[PDB]
Amino acid sequence: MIVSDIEANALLESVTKFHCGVIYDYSTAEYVSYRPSDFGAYLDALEAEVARGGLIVFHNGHKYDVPALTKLAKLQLNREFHLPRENCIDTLVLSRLIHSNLKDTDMGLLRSGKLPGALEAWGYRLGEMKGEYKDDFKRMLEEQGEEYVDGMEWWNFNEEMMDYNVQDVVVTKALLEKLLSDKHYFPPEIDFTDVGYTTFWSESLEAVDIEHRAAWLLAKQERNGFPFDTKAIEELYVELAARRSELLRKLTETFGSWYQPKGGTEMFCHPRTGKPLPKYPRIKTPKVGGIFKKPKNCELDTREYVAGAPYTPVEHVVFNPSSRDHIQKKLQEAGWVPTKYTDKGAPVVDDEVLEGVRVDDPEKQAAIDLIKEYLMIQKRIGQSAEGDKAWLRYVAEDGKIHGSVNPNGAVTGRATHAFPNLAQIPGVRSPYGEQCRAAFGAEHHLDGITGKPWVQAGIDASGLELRCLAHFMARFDNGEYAHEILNGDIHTKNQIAAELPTRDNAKTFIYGFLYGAGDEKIGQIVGAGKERGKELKKKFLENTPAIAALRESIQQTLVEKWKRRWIKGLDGRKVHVRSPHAALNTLLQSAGALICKLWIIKTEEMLVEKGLKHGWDGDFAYMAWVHDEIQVGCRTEEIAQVVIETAQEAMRWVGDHWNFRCLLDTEGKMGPNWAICH
């Protein structure tokens, strides 16, 4: 086993030069540095470890170092270099698994200050190295009277860079040993820094292997990117911008502008008692000016101020439909009486309350709908074009949006998506969802050889949450619930268990139950509120004792205040439990998450074993994984058919693999884009 790290001239997307690399070998206990001209030797050293059936540890190597080495080897040496997945370990991937209860700066992309909770020390140092190296580079520069430029610290190799590279390997080595010292994931009897790759994966908790396969495949997914119709979105942007203007014109006509105090420095005090009046707006008292200009032997002072004569400076403000404050201000002046405020005094002004607002003036009452449409349109404009993470700002030269994915960013094992978040694209059911969705699709990618558009295969795990629920209650009801889902009508049954009217109510209740939801939204289906809500969620449980037994068994295991603050996941990992009441949900969300993770892994593996190639230069390409669904680009219709059938096969395999008490299934759909494939 060896531990390594490299320094290059840019992010994966545009890297062209290998600056240096360092290698620590456990079999020799020595650190070896490789400078710019030792690149070939560095690569030879990595392949030598592969030839021995060894292991290579990088911190974040799955997303950067490894693909970067493949790229740089070809560019700089015209050499084919591909480290096999099974020979690579990633301490970032391991940390996110073992310290899943903690956040991280995602290697410097997020500012520490904003992250809640604490941060593992070694992982923190590794993620701040670029910024630290940068700060030191500038220091030395602005120390020799030399101007600093954007990011020149990465342009050329230098010893300061070599020293940081060496330090990265010492820290990575320490993180590794720290991670391997966790007996839950790594049996104590085995020295994991002294075993071959097959032993490493086979003797450690299944979760270790799964997270590494997930990171490897998702790294490939990011590189593939999601074909995006830039033109279609620019046109939608023009359309939305026009509706925004028109709604602004109309709202500015309805709610005129006004004045507000601003820039007051001195406190206002009663002229009589001199008593400070804090509630009164701040004033300003000029120390110069009079009715007549200063004499010299008297001409009028043109100025507008008079020493000692105080005034309240003010600003002119125009109604802004995006301001919750303006809306609150204008609506109450229309007779609206806020029924619910925030824990800061401000009255709640969300779509639901605006929906309830009733004012006498008919034009103002109608303006509310214009305000609701305005806020929604701003939400779309922000996500598609104007926001910091807007689609139009992220589409790349290859015509694709390469969204980032943290394979295990959520406590439950779910992945997190960002830059931009492709797991929060408006659905087809919401306003403009059809156009937003249609903009992401295989059809927007033209085959490199034939120029023909690709086809998309969209596949999702059918009623995954309910099935996970069925599985866990099987030890209390013997598969009754699982049997009803597969043959009967679990929804109707739930409609009977819970004395609810329509069958859809239950179909909305259950998901509210699984995905957590107060008695408010709960009873909000039965007209009432959290009132009948409490009654409803109780009558349900009453008629479905297996769920009550389950909840109780979870409690007994965690609360004796805690006996253990974690729950065991499907692959054996520890799943931190934030609160006792959210325990069942954490369990269900985690099973779905882990089932979906192994599923997409097994699907890709089966495709490759069937001879299909993963890549735009191949037969298929993973474009997105949104929790319980995957969108895959396919070179042909026939291939899309194979991907769909293979995904179904993989899901069955996963269900059998973890002896699931409820049969698992998938539904697939073929089409040109995300709108049609869901």
């Binding site: 005129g256 004045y259 009164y280 009028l300 004569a309 005034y311 309240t312 003010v314």
Partner: protein, 105 residues
């Protein structure tokens, strides 16, 4: 004796009026405005026949102030034949107002 203006009556009461008109742009939430208010009452009783004092509350009539670039209140505009002759901002004392008036009148 003070003329209380509105956005819609401004043009005829002020701009098309004959004689000197002192307009006070004010708001109920301004301390200084409340300070000069009494002063204006006494000024209206004194300058009758030479000048008319008028008030425009900027919250009830928001269209006029903007046109004159008001940045502080209370703002006093002395109009003569449809145009601003002089302008002072701040709670002037009774004494300071008389000088302002006498000098510009």
């Amino acid at each position: 004796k003070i003329i209380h203006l509105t956005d819609d009556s401004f043009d005829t009461d002020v701009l098309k009026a004959d004689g000197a008109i002192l307009v006070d742009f004010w708001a109920e939430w301004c301390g200084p405005c409340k300070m000069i208010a009494p002063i204006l009452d006494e000024i209206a009783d004194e300058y009758q026949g030479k000048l008319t004092v008028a008030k425009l509350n900027i919250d009830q009539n928001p269209g006029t102030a903007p046109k004159y670039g008001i940045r502080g209140i209370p703002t006093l505009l002395l109009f003569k034949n449809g145009e601003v002759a002089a302008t002072k901002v701040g709670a002037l004392s009774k004494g300071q107002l008389k000088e302002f008036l006498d000098a510009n009148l």
